């Protein structure tokens, strides 16, 4: 059991250092807040 547990922790470091889409849930929070701020400043150039 102790050899199977140590081999499972080492597979997380190989999955996080190669696949960049594993943290896509945290990336969508930052990208949604950047589009809401860039739209608010770009609406100042309108004439209405």
């Amino acid at each position: 059991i102790a050899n199977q547990f140590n081999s499972a922790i080492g597979k997380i470091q190989d999955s996080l250092s190669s696949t960049a889409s594993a943290l896509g849930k945290l990336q969508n929070v930052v990208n949604q807040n950047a589009q809401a701020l860039n739209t608010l400043v770009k609406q100042l150039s309108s004439n209405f």
């Binding site: 860039n38 400043v41 770009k42 100042l44 150039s45």
Partner: protein
């Protein structure tokens, strides 16, 4: 320089400070803008 003053250029009016910029401008353009249509660099019409 280094004082929040008023700007009265040939085609621009704003308020802010004026410090040294490390950018490079082309001779076929006067000022520069950011990604949100905000001015960040202006060229003196007298000296280059």
């Amino acid at each position: 320089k280094n004082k929040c003053v008023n700007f009265n250029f040939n085609g621009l009016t704003g308020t802010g400070v004026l410090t040294e910029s490390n950018k490079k401008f082309l001779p076929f353009q006067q000022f520069g803008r950011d990604i949100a249509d905000t001015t960040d660099a202006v060229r003196d019409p007298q000296t280059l």
